Write a protein that binds this ligand. Structure first.
Ligand SMILES: CNc1nc(Cl)nc2c1ncn2CC(=O)Nc1ccccc1
Length: 164
């Protein structure tokens, strides 16, 4: 059902993650980690302390879709296992140097055509698919966007809830 999902999404904050390639979203799904530019890293660290849940909604550029969404389970931490991100042009491993741990809530795709009815007040009420990496999505829009994804019945939200 959708009852545990709705409980996880209660009073969450939502951020749009735009990845340049599929490899890094694949790596993030396998290892439960994400990294972003320092300006977004600062915003996510602030948000993590302020809300019961911080939700990352992933979209690979040019794919026409979202590739799933995940919950921050920590602030960014430096050092540790060194993620072999595939770096876009102009990206260095230092720009992507802060590493967050994430718990996946849905690993399924959602095509942009299914979200055309949702607009984001925090981006001039443009459709929610439009936004730069790190764009915050307002509560109601973000909640409805997450509810549009196909259910991912491989994930048990019980352990996710046992972290909030
Ligand atoms: C693992 N993390 C990421 N992996 C990928 Cl592939 N793209 C990402 C990631 N975090 C943000 N973006 C979008 C982005 O900032 N692109 C970019 C900006 C400026 C110069 C070059 C490329």
């Amino acid at each position: 059902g959708t009852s545990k999902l709705k409980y996880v999404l209660q009073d969450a904050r939502f951020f749009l993650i735009k990845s340049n390639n599929h490899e890094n979203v694949s790596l993030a799904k396998a290892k439960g980690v994400w990294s972003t530019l320092p300006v977004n890293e600062k915003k996510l660290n602030l948000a993590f302390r302020s809300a019961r849940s911080v939700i990352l909604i992933f979209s690979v550029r040019e794919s026409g879709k979202f590739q799933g969404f995940a919950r921050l389970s920590s602030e960014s931490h430096h050092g540790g296992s060194p993620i072999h991100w595939v770096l876009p042009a102009g990206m260095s491993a230092k720009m992507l140097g802060g590493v967050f741990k994430i718990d996946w809530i849905c690993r399924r795709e959602l095509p942009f055509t299914k979200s055309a009815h949702l607009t984001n007040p925090w981006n001039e009420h443009k459709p929610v698919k439009i936004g730069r990496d790190g764009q915050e999505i307002e509560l109601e829009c973000g909640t409805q966007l997450c509810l549009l994804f196909p259910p991912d019945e491989s994930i048990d939200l019980y352990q996710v809830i046992h972290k909030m």
